[PDB]
Design a protein around this ligand. Structure first.
Ligand SMILES: *[C@@H]1O[C@H](CO)[C@@H](O[C@@H]2O[C@H](CO)[C@@H](O[C@@H]3O[C@H](CO)[C@@H](O)[C@H](O)[C@@H]3O)[C@H](O)[C@H]2NC(C)=O)[C@H](O)[C@H]1NC(C)=O
Ligand SMILES: N[C@H]1CCSSC[C@@H](C(=O)NCc2ccccc2CC(=O)O)NC(=O)C[C@H](Cc2ccc(O)cc2)NC1=O
Ligand SMILES: *[C@@H]1O[C@H](CO)[C@@H](O[C@@H]2O[C@H](CO)[C@@H](O)[C@H](O)[C@H]2NC(C)=O)[C@H](O)[C@H]1NC(C)=O
Ligand SMILES: *[C@@H]1O[C@H](CO)[C@@H](O[C@@H]2O[C@H](CO)[C@@H](O)[C@H](O)[C@H]2NC(C)=O)[C@H](O)[C@H]1NC(C)=O
Ligand SMILES: *[C@@H]1O[C@H](CO)[C@@H](O[C@@H]2O[C@H](CO)[C@@H](O)[C@H](O)[C@H]2NC(C)=O)[C@H](O)[C@H]1NC(C)=O
Ligand SMILES: *[C@@H]1O[C@H](CO)[C@@H](O)[C@H](O)[C@H]1NC(C)=O
Ligand SMILES: *[C@@H]1O[C@H](CO)[C@@H](O)[C@H](O)[C@H]1NC(C)=O
Ligand SMILES: *[C@@H]1O[C@H](CO)[C@@H](O)[C@H](O)[C@H]1NC(C)=O
Ligand SMILES: *[C@@H]1O[C@H](CO)[C@@H](O)[C@H](O)[C@H]1NC(C)=O
Ligand SMILES: *[C@@H]1O[C@H](CO)[C@@H](O)[C@H](O)[C@H]1NC(C)=O
Ligand SMILES: [Zn+2]
Length: 856
């Protein structure tokens, strides 16, 4: 390596611009190796002497420079940096502005063992013959490893993939196949699309498909589970007809292929014409799948289809605006559901996810949804709750403040104007303003939301017939808030209005002296509202009297807010618990769960700290509130989906802390199920709750383990797995984490699941953090530093620590690792989580024992 590399920055130079890529690769699954050839059509709009590409883990043999008048090809010199995963091609004779050239590079590499890029694995059949499968995960920066390219989403280009298969496999990609000793299939040329959407799969599969008003929707799967693809096609065809009507642009490809991958870490991918999925996520069987399992497969297919337009067709210029794709997809995912799939009551998950996202956003570790991103690790952490749900709340807020129809016009204009192009944060805002040329100037209103941390705190004071509103930052520079308040008059009549706050303080005029208010119409706004004690007390009385004047979304938003507010010390803890006394008149799921999550969170914290006494006192008092609702629950899979998951939460809550007869009944059902060798029908809703009880027995634990290896229902196994990991035998728990990590018997994709479940409860609480801590570099090899997977793990096992001593060790451990690792958001956020737990223990623990006492 004589001369040094010609580029000294992370981001690619803009002189070179690709037009067309030819990727012809030949892979041997036996040795986990392949040979690939990349032909790139490149136009240089700048006078340059050097060409730079992203490339890693590659054996390069020969490169060609060939755009001379009659020259066939010329040999060239390749240079590699490798710190930035970049390679430089010193082309002879400088490229001229506007002149097209063609670069072909020859290389060899290995199939990776990590869950990233081009990877392969071996899975076992029903007939028990080992088979191999190859898949693609290029998003976000894994294309570099696969083939040498301009690995940046703004460098859109056309792609033609030529792939070779070993026997008579299924070779699939973005475009349909037309190729006729081993066979070589060449897929057709595709739309100008980014490099990270390139996808190709190689394995033994079968196909179930239907025509959808011109296009062929194919849902592929491994021969074993091809019967379980019936539900996916039903929804996929229904959704595509729905999405094509609300975005008048129709699907641009001849074939839409959704595939169920045996392993695969991410829930699903959006690769144009090749939706890659998790087998647990795409497959479904009514007999063995729960209501939540039916809801999970519906939303992911809804979420994946939205990307076809948001991200595939029109995508972000750079990841610092990644919320411009996932934020839109998540919004469009739950919006689509609410119109064509209202039965599912999918608003609940969106609410809960926003409640959980708002807590992470409120921390000082949070960043703006449009935030400067430079390092590779900085890019990897962009796939967090904010991008999915703070970008999704931002979109939701606009739809409610503005009209529903206007949103369609802003959406449709946005897609056509920027089709097959890179967009920015500001590009999206003009589109709203373009269709609405009034005094709105959206880009100024949304500049506050997209350029700063957190959300506002709306403090509401009512004196007489005036509503006093002030906006404050949330912690333990000014936004434009769309306030929406629901008032009840003295004749108890419904009346609702909306106002916009662009100032720190405000006063809203009321028509008549009211009984109470609600300051956020449902959730709908990305902010937290605090009320005056009397106004807070007014809400509690109404709730104690009749809770149905409010919504379930409106009543569970009150619970999340009061506890969040109670946690940080703004308002005394008792008043938060004082509100949750209306549970007797409560039959809806969203208020019940958010109360249960708030109580379940508190109990887990105390249990860790040795306060066994206080913890059970808490779940007792809550059990007595919900004793009526809990006791009338039937183990029968009966009721409209929201009712079905309403059952599981209560059955889980009673059984997890050994309350009532839940354990008594579940033991009997499990014995019935076990003494039937798994043949006997056991209801989908109560399966996980029964499995948890069955796993307490060593025989039950061992019997279940035999089923997990034995059965093929992925949805039923993840229910069983939750039972094994909820076991209290630390020796059993440790083994589960070691198995997935190495991948024997347990697939590595569950490692985050097992580590998170192990760390929740007292046995294995220390075990989970230590296994993450002591196996950390093996974990960084499997999932990149900054990845959701590794950020999920850190947060999954560190949220229940509440001690300054514990805070000192997590902080010290990451110091021991590296400066790149210690500056990570996951380390910084999860350490701050522990901090707040110290304070919550400080401010409310002492008093909590006061309301939690038996007074003579
Ligand atoms: C279709 O797409 C084009 C390109 O995205 C849109 O053009 C954009 O229009 C906005 C209007 O606000 C321009 O923003 C302006 O920027 C200057 C300074 O940079 C500022 O002085 C103005 O007050 C305003 O902020 C924006 O520049 C322009 N795009 C580009 C690339 O310049 C167009 O509005 C879209 N909609 C249609 C044509 O209906
Ligand atoms: N951006 C692309 C992919 C880039 S990788 S994102 C990180 C990774 C991930 O782990 N998700 C959570 C998850 C989901 C299923 C099983 C396990 C786990 C992790 C756990 O067990 O905790 N996959 C995704 O999130 C898929 C999500 C699309 C999506 C679908 C359904 C939704 O309801 C929301 C969102 N992502 C995209 O389209
Ligand atoms: C990859 O290499 C393996 C061997 O290392 C090939 O597998 C066998 O190859 C021999 C000769 O090519 C055949 O006679 C066998 O029947 C093959 N059987 C099995 C089960 O693999 C394999 O064909 C090669 N594949 C590619 C795509 O190159
Ligand atoms: C019962 O409540 C309703 C809620 O709409 C009252 O209707 C309006 O009340 C406000 C406040 O007094 C007035 O400003 C409006 O003009 C009322 N609407 C009319 C008059 O059409 C309603 O008036 C209440 N019933 C009464 C006062 O008898
Ligand atoms: C209970 O079910 C298991 C499978 O979960 C049975 O074990 C397999 O049975 C098949 C036939 O169904 C045999 O061909 C295999 O040899 C068995 N596998 C193993 C690992 O032993 C089992 O026979 C069923 N009943 C009992 C009482 O064991
Ligand atoms: C994988 O391939 C790369 C590129 O050819 C090569 O450097 C390396 O020796 C192979 N694998 C590992 C883990 O070393
Ligand atoms: C790369 O190719 C060269 C030349 O064919 C060879 O000597 C070397 O072993 C190859 N590297 C790998 C990792 O296969
Ligand atoms: C390269 O081909 C494109 C095809 O779109 C054409 O626009 C361009 O004129 C060609 N290059 C030059 C320097 O003209
Ligand atoms: C699988 O693909 C073929 C390709 O022609 C198609 O005709 C067939 O209908 C598909 N199989 C089904 C729907 O079972
Ligand atoms: C079983 O549930 C009922 C429902 O009220 C409860 O009263 C009873 O105490 C439970 N059985 C126990 C605790 O043994
Ligand atoms: Zn997504």
């Amino acid at each position: 390596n004589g001369k040094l590399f010609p580029w000294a920055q992370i981001r690619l130079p803009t002189a070179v611009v690709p037009l067309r890529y030819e990727l012809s690769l030949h892979p041997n699954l036996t040795s986990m190796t392949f040979r690939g050839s990349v032909t790139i059509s490149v136009q240089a709009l700048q006078v340059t002497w050097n060409i730079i590409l992203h490339s890693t883990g590659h054996n390069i043999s020969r490169v060609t420079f060939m755009s001379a008048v009659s020259s066939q090809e010329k040999q060239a010199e390749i240079l590699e940096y490798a710190y930035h995963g970049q390679i430089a091609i010193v082309a002879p004779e400088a490229l001229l502005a506007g002149h097209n050239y063609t670069l072909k590079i020859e290389y060899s590499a290995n199939i990776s063992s990590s869950y990233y890029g081009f990877y392969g694995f071996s899975y076992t059949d029903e007939s028990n013959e080992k088979k191999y499968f190859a898949a693609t995960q290029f998003e976000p920066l894994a294309a570099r490893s696969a083939f040498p390219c301009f690995d940046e989403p703004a460098f859109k280009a056309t792609f033609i993939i030529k792939i070779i298969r070993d026997e008579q496999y299924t070779a699939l990609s973005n475009m349909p196949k037309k190729s006729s000793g081993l066979v070589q299939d060449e897929f057709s040329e595709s739309v100008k699309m980014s490099t990270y959407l390139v996808a190709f799969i190689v394995g033994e599969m079968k196909n179930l498909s239907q025509d959808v008003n011109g296009t062929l929707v194919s849902i592929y799967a491994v021969p074993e589970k091809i019967g379980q693809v019936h539900y996916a096609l039903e929804t996929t065809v229904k959704l595509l007809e729905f999405f094509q009507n609300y975005f008048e642009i129709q699907y641009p490809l001849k074939k839409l292929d959704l595939v169920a991958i045996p392993d695969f870490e991410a829930g699903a991918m959006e690769n144009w014409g090749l939706l890659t999925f998790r087998e647990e996520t795409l497959l479904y069987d009514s007999n063995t799948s729960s209501m939540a399992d039916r809801k999970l497969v519906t939303k992911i297919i809804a979420h994946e289809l939205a990307h076809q337009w948001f991200g595939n067709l029109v995508t972000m210029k750079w990841w610092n605006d990644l919320w411009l794709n996932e934020g839109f997809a998540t919004f469009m995912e739950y919006f689509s559901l609410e119109k064509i799939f209202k039965e599912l009551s999918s608003y609940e998950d969106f609410l809960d996810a926003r409640f959980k996202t708002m807590k992470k956003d409120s921390l000082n570790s949070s960043h703006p949804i449009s935030s400067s991103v430079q390092s590779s690790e900085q890019i990897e952490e962009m796939f967090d709750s904010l991008s999915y749900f703070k970008g999704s709340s931002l979109l939701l807020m606009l739809k409610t403040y503005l009209s529903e129809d206007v949103f369609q016009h802003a959406v449709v204009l946005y897609l056509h104007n920027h089709s097959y192009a890179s967009i920015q944060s500001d590009d999206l805002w003009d589109s709203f303003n373009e269709v609405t040329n009034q005094t709105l100037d959206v880009k100024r209103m949304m500049k506050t939301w997209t350029l700063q941390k957190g959300f506002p705190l709306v403090t509401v004071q009512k004196k007489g017939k005036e509503l006093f509103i002030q906006q404050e930052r949330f912690f333990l520079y000014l936004w434009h808030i769309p306030l929406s308040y629901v008032t009840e008059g003295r004749n108890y009549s419904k009346y609702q209005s909306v106002s916009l706050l662009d100032k720190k303080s405000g006063v809203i005029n009321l028509t008549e002296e009211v009984l109470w208010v609600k300051v956020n119409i449902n959730m709908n706004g990305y902010y937290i509202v605090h009320y005056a004690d009397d106004d807070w007390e007014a809400l509690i009385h109404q709730l104690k009297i009749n809770p149905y004047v409010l919504s379930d979304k409106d009543r569970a938003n009150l619970i999340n807010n009061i506890f969040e507010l109670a946690g940080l010390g703004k308002v005394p803890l008792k008043r938060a618990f004082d509100l949750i006394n209306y549970l007797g008149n409560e039959n809806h799921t969203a208020p019940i769960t958010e109360a249960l999550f708030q109580t379940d969170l508190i109990y887990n914290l105390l249990e860790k700290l040795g306060y066994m006494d206080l913890a059970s006192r808490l779940v007792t008092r809550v059990f007595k509130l919900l004793q009526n609702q809990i006791q009338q629950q039937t183990w029968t899979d009966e009721g409209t989906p929201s009712m079905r998951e309403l059952r599981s939460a209560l059955l889980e809550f009673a059984c997890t802390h050994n309350l009532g007869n839940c354990s008594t009944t579940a033991m009997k059902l499990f014995d019935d199920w076990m003494a039937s060798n798994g043949t006997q029908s056991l209801p989908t809703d109560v399966m996980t709750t029964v499995f948890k009880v069955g796993a307490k027995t060593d025989k039950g634990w061992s019997f279940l383990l035999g089923k997990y290896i034995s059965i093929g229902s992925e949805a039923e196994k993840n229910k069983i797995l939750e039972a094994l990991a909820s076991s209290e035998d630390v020796r059993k728990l440790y083994w589960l984490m070691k198995s997935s990590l190495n991948g024997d018997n347990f697939r590595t994709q569950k490692l985050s699941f097992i580590i998170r479940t192990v760390g929740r409860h007292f046995p294995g609480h220390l075990l989970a953090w230590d296994f993450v801590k002591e196996n950390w570099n093996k974990l960084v090899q499997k999932f990149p530093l900054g990845s959701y997977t590794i950020q999920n793990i850190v947060a999954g096992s560190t949220y229940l620590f509440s001690t300054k001593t514990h805070l000192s060790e997590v902080q010290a451990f990451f110091e021991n690792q590296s400066e790149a690792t210690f500056r990570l958001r996951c380390v910084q956020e999860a350490l701050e989580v522990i901090q707040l737990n110290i304070q919550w223990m400080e401010k409310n623990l002492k008093s909590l024992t006061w309301w939690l006492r038996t007074e003579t």
